[PDB]
Structure 1
Amino acid sequence: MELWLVRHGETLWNREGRLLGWTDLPLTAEGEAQARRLKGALPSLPAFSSDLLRARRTAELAGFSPRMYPELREIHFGALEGALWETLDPRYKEALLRFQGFHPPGGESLSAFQERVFRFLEGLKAPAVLFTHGGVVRAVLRALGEDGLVPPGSAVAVDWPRRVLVRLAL
């Protein structure tokens, strides 16, 4: 199934290297500019979006009218929400880089997070555009044997659950 995964535009914490999960931060002005540049560049397929403001806003500025689904949320960081990556305990930093053995205090385990993400993808019947988060895009790309680091406000199309089709960044 052709799926477009769109990472929302820049937020202040995305700039400052701070963990951003369920904290409902808004897009910065450049984040909004990135979202607007997606309008007309993405296929006009039905859209779905995380219910977090930054994702909803990105969908809107991109010219879409998404349905809101919590399953598309970034992973909840719990007590690590907003945590400065610089002072993050190396134990967490390493687990985040490897994308394994990570369960932030009071947040979601990486296993529960990826299960709800992939479960959601399994429920799609036709190609669609998913406005979501970096963690979600990374989970999908990694499962497909590619690294899932993409820039904010960019998109990647995949032929789930087989391979990646194209990476769109502008």
Structure 2
Amino acid sequence: PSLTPRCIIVRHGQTEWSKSGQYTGLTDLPLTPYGEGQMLRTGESVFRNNQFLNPDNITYIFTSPRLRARQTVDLVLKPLSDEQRAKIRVVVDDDLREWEYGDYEGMLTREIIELRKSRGLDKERPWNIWRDGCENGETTQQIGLRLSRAIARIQNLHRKHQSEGRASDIMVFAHGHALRYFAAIWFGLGVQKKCETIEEIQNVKSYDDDTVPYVKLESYRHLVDNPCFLLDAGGIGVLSYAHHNIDEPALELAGPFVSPPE
């Protein structure tokens, strides 16, 4: 059979706030100079030195609209030729933005804890973003819904490519909470929820690319607790499928690592 399709998740490189631990959501920070170099080196490793990715197999790249994610795309793809890039579709999708932190934008965890405490919250148990979301920001159900929509579009593309006998690596450039969340629901963590409310059923028009079919969900997944994942800035994870079957989504424990050939 053709190579099993994969979804390659890439967290953006260093910004001024990723370094301090400040929560970076809608704030449109650029990469730091260090962060730029970090992503240049990451591209060189995956394409040139280690060949963990083959440009010929990359079909689509989906990115968050945030500058830091878009910069990361360009830096990671630098080792490619213009012809190789010409064969890869890049799609900006608002469904891949970071968790909307609301009141907590730019804060550290310990500051958020103290602010919530001062507001009379968390008297029974600690704040847990995965369960509780953020004041004046997104609930966990809101982020689960939109990530589920993006997953469905990606998996639909994979099914089509597989049916054509085509390898298909699809890359997703986004953010730390969103990507851990995305990985978690990909392989079936959390709970399934039927799409019933207006928000659950609506098409928010999060991307403009008519080559990517919209998938109207019947159900979605969301988390209610911490999936207990690590993913550094610049980190790369891999989501794929068991038994060459799009209906068996799975997490690749090796991330992008494969044994060298021969």
TM-score (norm 1): 0.86
Higher RCO by CA contacts (8 Å cutoff, separation 6 or greater): 1
**Higher alpha-carbon deviation: 22-31 or 50-59:** 22-31
The Cα of 1:52 is off from its aligned counterpart by 0.3
Q: Deviation of residue 80 (structure 1)?
A: 1.1
The structural deviation recorded for 1:111 is 1.2
The answer as to 2:110 corresponding to 1:86 is yes
Structure with larger Rg: 2
- Following TM superposition, by how much is the alpha carbon of 1:77 offset from its aligned partner in structure 2, in angstroms? 0.6
| Aligned-residue identity in percent | 27
TM superposition shift of 1:35 = 1.2
The total of aligned residue pairs comes to 166
Which residue of 2 is the match for residue 132 of structure 1? 174
Partners of 1:114 and 1:16 in 2: how far apart?
A: 26
SS at match of 1:88: helix
Secondary structure of 2:110's aligned partner: coil
Paired residue for 1:164? 251
**Aligned letter for 2:109?**
W
CA distance in 2 between counterparts of 1:148 and 1:43 reads: 26
Aligned-pair distance for 1:38? 2.6
SS at match of 1:94: coil
Name whichever of 109-118 and 59-68 sits farther off. 59-68
**CA deviation string 1:86-145 (max 9, x = no partner):** 22126496313xx2122x122111210111012111012133011111112211333335
**Is the Cα contact below 8 Å between 1:11 and 1:26 reproduced in 2?**
yes
Cα distance change, pair 93–141 in 1 and its aligned pair in 2 (3 A): farther
The match for 1:101 is: 132
- Unmatched 5+ stretches in structure 1: none
Measure, in 1, the Cα distance between the counterparts of 2:54 and 2:232: 19
Task: Find the residue that maps to 1:83 and give its secondary structure.
Answer: coil
In structure 2, C-alpha distance between the alignment counterparts of 1:54 and 1:43, rounded to whole Å: 24
Residue 76 in 1 paired to residue 100 in 2? Answer: yes
Native 8 Å contact 1:3 1:129 kept in 2? yes
CA RMSD of the aligned region, Å? 2.3
Deviation at 1:84, TM superposition (A): 2.5
Contact 1:49–1:69 (Cα < 8 Å) also in 2: yes
Q: SS where residue 107 of structure 1 aligns?
A: coil
Cα deviations by residue, 1:58-94 (Å, 9 ceiling, x for unpaired): 0011117632111110111112110122221264963
